[PDB]
Structures are given as structure tokens and as C-alpha cells.
Design a protein around this ligand. Structure first.
Ligand SMILES: Nc1nc2c(ncn2[C@@H]2O[C@H](COP(=O)(O)OP(=O)(O)OP(=O)(O)O)[C@@H](O)[C@H]2O)c(=O)[nH]1
Ligand SMILES: O=C(O)C(=O)CS(=O)(=O)O
Ligand SMILES: [Mn+2]
Ligand SMILES: [Mn+2]
Ligand SMILES: [Mn+2]
Ligand code: NA
Length: 611
């Protein structure tokens, strides 16, 4: 088979074996080993020992610190240049631009960023050759969704970051059982490098290898490849999450008749013990995680979490909309997480949890803005920038996009069906964002077509930005075709279309205070939705859809909440709103805008005119 050694990197394999790997997985590893020139190859087995030893190695290297207050919890602090998903360096490669984004009239699309094959190939060749010199290439075999669910898909991530390996063990199902379940089946090829070959040319900040200048997160859906360079952070480096499970998957979903969405999934149970599942799409930093593991204030009600971020949904042969959480953990925002805003998070993150860019207490614990847990006198705080921090410093102690990475299995209210291979049946879909004015607390769509329009029309504070379906950063293909795909669900055989709602937690009076207390009190909104799905006559028709009737919302124990301002619908506001939606859709979607969405816009405009 060889004149010399071939492309045989067997000699550098430090765990597992290239002979054990399926043939196509072997080619992927060896081809990229030849390209990236790692010193060693580590094939991940997913075991506790591997995990423990990896964490101890990172500990030795100064990459993570042990949080000695908790049971097996860890803290990573990044280079301040590498702190979040970067949309501007995120691209999708296709033959035709129009398959990736609609061609905007104004010239700049907000619906994705296309790059040509030719331009990507140059970018790739300027980055990856030799990029892993002196480092270990980890081979991470992972399943998005419960192992052997008919809805689950398998990936292989190659990375030179141990932090990514650890984080992927929490956020996916990874190891030898995935390889065994995979066999000779297809898989998504995920390549990641932090982009800092040894010896280091540039100096390392906070022991966090990254390369901001060359950062590029690419998707090649026709090759089933995700190729990410230069960032070690979250959605840029944990390739199963946004890159696979939203961008690549949304495209697969369209081709195969299912849906891959930026949605939490929760089970809600009323005082009678009657149970329904709801899916909800809010943009990043707009409260999915708070809702997904809500502690409902209303007596007798019970919320259980299936997932807090991604939903894969498909109508089964019975016509129920079946949803799975393709993730295995929560990669949740840390700041804001108190006992009051999110008690079930506080209990999940006690053990086996990795923290990134939060502050550290002198007694080995974690701190962040809005934690609402005062410390004993004498307890001092090390910031996320590794410096001493008093409450009267100008800066925050934790970065605003600082995160925890915690196993889903540890959540006290994790739903008993959260790993059922068939998924949970969705009966309602909720859209929402941050709107300080105009938009009531809750309303219900008049039809599937109106509901799809409601999704398409979503807007949210960062400056109120457009974020249709909470998917603006994540569409794997043409948004217009995405809308067509959603609308097509109405013509499926026996499909039982969920009720669609829109919510707004963030409406404010003219002094800028929140008109609604929210958090646990949002169970009062979910009550209404529950009843409306049941067929109850609790709804009054308005121009924008159905709102709750007077006294239909249980406001017992809230007292003097202003229903007037909170449910108010202004003609003047909504005239402006429809005009802005019209111009956006005309500019950003144009020829790919489905007729039915145009019709809903014309209908909404007409209903508003009659006010
Ligand atoms: N006023 C109000 N704010 C809320 C509520 N729920 C969440 N928030 C706010 O939303 C933020 C937390 O939401 P995140 O966890 O960042 O949002 P997310 O949707 O999980 O974001 P990703 O994980 O990045 O997708 C904090 O600023 C909270 O104050 C609510 O019911 N009322
Ligand atoms: O931005 C989001 O919606 C996230 O969930 C965080 S990340 O996975 O993109 O880093
Ligand atoms: Mn070393
Ligand atoms: Mn998200
Ligand atoms: Mn979240
Ligand atoms: Na560090």
C-alpha cells in the first residue's frame, strides 16, 4: 500500500487506533493530520478517566483552574479578543450566493454571509497548513441527539484545543459508543484549530490560544464540512452546536422535511396533572434558558426542561410535531443567573461544570453580575481578567457573554422524556424578543401562515435589530426558502400544526421600568397558552392577533400590574411597525419572499388601517 510510510500517522496515535476507525473517518483524520501537522493524535473514548486526565493536564498548563468550593468544577479565562461568537467572520460556501442568502436590493444582506468556493480555498490555504504543529489533534466522535434516536445525527470534530474536547463531552454525547453506533454511516466533518502552531510566533494571553486576525468560521453544506479557525470560544469552536445543529442541519432539514431551530423545549403540567410541550425561539440574550427551566410561581404548575437552545423537530406519521434536544448540556449565560431569576440553573451548575470568563471568589467559588448571593466579609473577588475586583470598580467582574457549560442530566427538573428517541410532541410555538414599546405581553397567531409571518417579523434590542425566528445568525440557506419550507408544513398529510404565540417580557413604561415582573411569573402567560391550546374561550381578537380577554390572565399575587399599558395596542405604533417590516422584507428577501408572507403583511396592514 506504500512506497515509504504513505500518509500513515499511526506512529503519532497516543490513544485509540486508526485501524479501529471506520474507513471514511480514518481518511478525514489522516488527510487533516497530513495538512495540520499535529505532533500527536488522540482518539477520544469519552470515558471519565480520559476526561479527568485531560482536566488535570489543562490544570498543569494554566489553561483552566479548579474551583475548590464545588464538586469537580473548573474555570477558564480567555484572551479578551476571543469572548463570543463572531457573526462577521462567519460564512457559508455554496456555488450560488442565492442558495445561501437572498440577493438584497440595497446590496448588503443581514440574513447571512456568503463566500465563494474560490475565496474560501485561498482563506483555508492561508490558515490550516501546519497549524497544529507541536499540538495534539483530538478526534471527537459525537452524537447530536440521544444515541440511536432516528432524529440524531453523528459528527466528528478534529481540534487542537483540550478545552473544546472537555466542553464537547458535556454538550454532546461523545466517545467510543458513538463510533460503534456510527459504523460506515455518513457524518458531518468538523475541523477546528485555534490557529497557533508551536513554536508561538505571537505571545499567548491568559494561556488562551487564539488568532483573532485569521478567525473564520466556515460552512460547506454540499461537502458536509464545517471548518473553523482561530477562535476557541463557544459557537465558534463547539462545532456541534450552532455550526452543525443550526446551520448545516437547517439545510438538511429543508431537504428532508424537518426543522432545526434556535428553540428551547419545555414540558408544562397544570394543577390537574395535564401535560403539554412548548417550543420557544428568542434571540441570544433574550431569556430562553430562564424560560426552559422556569420555577413557576403559580401553585400546582410544573415546568420541566427538555432543552434550552436548539430544537430539531419533525412531524411523525401520526402528525404530531416531534422535537428532540440535540444537545447533551446547557451552555448558558452566567451573569443574571440568581436563585430568583433561575434557581434550577443554580442547582445544575453545582458540580461537573466548566465556567468561562466569570469571576472567582477567594474561597474557590464563582461570581458574576446579578448572582444575588452576598459574600462573607473578608471574601475577595478575582475578575474574569485575572485581577482583584471591588464592587466599586468601573468594570464588571464577569464578562457579559461569560458562560457555564453543565450536563443536562444534572438539571433537577430535566424532563423524563428529554432523551426519548421519538422526541416530545410540540403543541405550541412561541416567538419573542426585547421590545421596550408597542408589543403586548402575549398574543396568538390567527393561522399557521400568520404565525410564520409573526416569526418572520421578529425584532429585538441589541437599537432594535431584525431577528426573524431568532435565526438571523444561523440560517443555513436562503431565508426566503426557509419561509417557504415553514409554510409548506400546512400541506403535510395529517400534520397537527401547533398554535403560534408571540411574547414580550421586556415592555417598559415611559420611565423605563419593566411593566411585567417576568421570570417565574411568566407561568401566568404559559397558563393562558395552555388553555388556548385546550380550546378555551379566553381570547379577544385584535388587529395583531388574539390577546387574553379581560380577567383571563391570573394576576393573583401580583397586585398593581398595569394591564392597560402592558396590553395596549396603538394604531400609530403598528402603522410604523408594518411599514418597517414591509421595507425590510422587500429589501432583504425580495424575489424569494413567499406570496403567503406578502399576503399576511397586506392583511395585517389592512387590519391596522381599520383601527
Ligand atoms: N425582564 C425580564 N428579563 C428576562 C426574563 N428572562 C430572561 N431575562 C433576561 O435575559 C437575560 C438572560 O437570558 P440569556 O440566558 O442571556 O438568553 P438565551 O436566550 O439563553 O441566550 P443564548 O444562550 O445565547 O441563546 C438576562 O438579561 C435576563 O434579565 C424575564 O422574564 N423578564
Ligand atoms: O449565541 C448564542 O445563541 C449561544 O447560544 C451561544 S454560542 O453557542 O453561540 O457561543
Ligand atoms: Mn507543557
Ligand atoms: Mn443560542
Ligand atoms: Mn441560553
Ligand atoms: Na487562563
Amino acid at each position: 500500500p506504500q512506497l515509504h510510510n504513505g500518509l500513515d500517522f499511526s506512529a503519532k496515535v497516543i490513544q485509540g487506533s486508526l485501524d479501529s476507525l471506520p474507513q471514511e473517518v480514518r481518511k478525514f483524520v489522516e488527510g487533516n493530520a497530513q495538512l495540520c501537522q499535529p505532533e500527536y493524535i488522540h482518539i477520544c473514548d469519552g470515558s471519565e478517566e480520559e476526561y479527568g486526565r485531560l482536566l488535570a493536564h489543562m490544570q498543569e498548563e494554566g489553561v483552566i483552574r479548579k474551583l475548590k468550593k464545588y464538586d469537580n468544577c473548573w474555570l477558564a479565562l480567555t484572551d479578551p479578543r476571543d469572548v463570543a461568537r463572531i457573526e462577521s467572520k462567519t460564512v457559508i460556501i455554496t456555488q450560488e450566493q442565492r442558495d445561501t442568502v437572498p440577493i438584497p436590493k440595497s446590496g448588503q444582506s443581514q440574513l447571512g454571509r456568503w463566500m465563494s468556493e474560490e475565496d474560501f480555498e485561498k482563506a483555508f490555504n492561508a490558515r490550516f497548513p501546519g497549524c497544529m504543529k507541536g499540538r495534539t489533534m483530538y478526534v471527537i466522535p459525537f452524537s447530536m441527539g440521544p444515541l440511536g434516536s432516528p432524529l440524531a445525527k453523528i459528527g466528528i470534530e478534529l481540534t487542537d484545543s483540550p478545552y473544546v474536547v472537555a466542553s464537547m463531552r458535556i454538550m454532546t454525547r461523545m466517545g467510543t459508543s458513538v463510533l460503534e453506533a456510527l459504523g460506515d454511516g455518513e457524518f458531518i466533518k468538523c475541523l477546528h484549530s485555534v490557529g497557533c502552531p508551536l513554536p508561538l510566533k505571537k505571545p499567548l494571553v491568559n494561556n488562551w490560544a487564539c488568532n483573532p486576525e485569521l478567525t473564520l468560521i466556515a460552512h460547506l453544506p454540499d461537502r458536509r464540512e464545517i471548518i473553523s479557525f482561530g477562535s476557541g470560544y463557544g459557537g465558534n469552536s463547539l462545532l456541534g452546536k450552532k455550526c452543525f445543529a443550526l446551520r448545516i442541519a437547517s439545510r438538511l432539514a429543508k431537504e428532508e422535511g424537518w426543522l432545526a431551530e434556535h428553540m428551547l423545549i419545555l414540558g408544562i403540567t397544570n394543577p390537574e396533572g395535564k401535560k403539554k410541550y412548548l417550543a420557544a425561539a428568542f434571540p441570544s440574550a433574550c431569556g430562553k434558558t430562564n424560560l426552559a427551566m422556569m420555577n413557576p410561581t403559580l401553585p400546582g404548575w410544573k415546568v420541566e426542561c427538555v432543552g434550552d437552545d436548539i430544537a430539531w423537530m419533525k412531524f411523525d406519521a401520526q402528525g404530531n410535531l416531534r422535537a428532540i434536544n440535540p444537545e447533551n448540556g446547557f451552555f448558558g449565560v452566567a451573569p443574571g443567573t440568581s436563585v430568583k431569576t433561575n434557581p434550577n440553573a443554580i442547582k445544575t451548575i453545582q458540580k461537573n461544570t466548566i465556567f468561562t470568563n466569570v469571576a472567582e471568589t477567594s474561597d474557590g467559588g464563582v461570581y458574576w453580575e446579578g448572582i444575588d448571593e452576598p459574600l462573607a466579609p473578608g471574601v475577595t473577588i478575582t475578575s474574569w481578567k485575572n485581577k482583584e475586583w471591588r464592587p466599586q470598580d468601573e468594570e464588571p467582574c464577569a464578562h457579559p457573554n461569560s458562560r457555564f457549560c453543565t450536563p443536562a442530566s444534572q438539571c433537577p427538573i430535566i424532563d423524563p422524556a428529554w432523551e426519548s428517541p421519538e422526541g416530545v410532541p410540540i403543541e405550541g410555538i412561541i416567538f419573542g424578543g426585547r421590545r421596550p414599546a408597542g408589543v403586548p405581553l402575549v398574543y396568538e397567531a390567527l393561522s399557521w401562515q400568520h404565525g410564520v409571518f409573526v416569526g418572520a417579523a421578529m425584532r429585538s434590542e441589541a437599537v432594535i435589530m431584525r431577528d426573524p425566528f431568532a435565526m438571523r445568525p444561523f440560517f443555513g440557506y436562503n431565508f426566503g426558502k426557509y419561509l417557504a419550507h415553514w409554510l409548506s408544513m400546512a400541506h403535510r398529510p395529517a400534520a397537527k400544526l401547533p398554535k403560534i404565540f408571540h411574547v414580550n417580557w421586556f415592555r417598559k413604561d415611559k420611565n423605563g421600568k419593566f411593566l411585567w415582573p417576568g421570570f417565574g411569573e411568566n407561568s401566568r402567560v404559559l397558563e393562558w397558552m395552555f388553555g388556548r391550546i385546550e380550546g378555551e374561550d379566553s381570547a379577544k381578537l385584535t388587529p395583531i392577533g388574539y390577546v387574553p380577554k379581560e380577567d383571563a390572565l391570573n394576576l393573583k399575587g401580583l397586585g398593581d400590574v398595569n394591564v392597560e399599558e402592558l396590553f395596549g395596542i396603538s394604531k400609530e405604533f403598528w402603522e410604523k411597525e408594518v411599514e418597517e417590516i414591509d421595507k425590510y422584507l422587500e429589501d432583504q428577501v425580495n424575489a424569494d419572499l413567499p406570496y403567503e408572507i406578502e399576503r399576511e403583511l397586506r392583511a395585517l396592514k389592512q387590519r391596522i388601517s381599520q383601527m
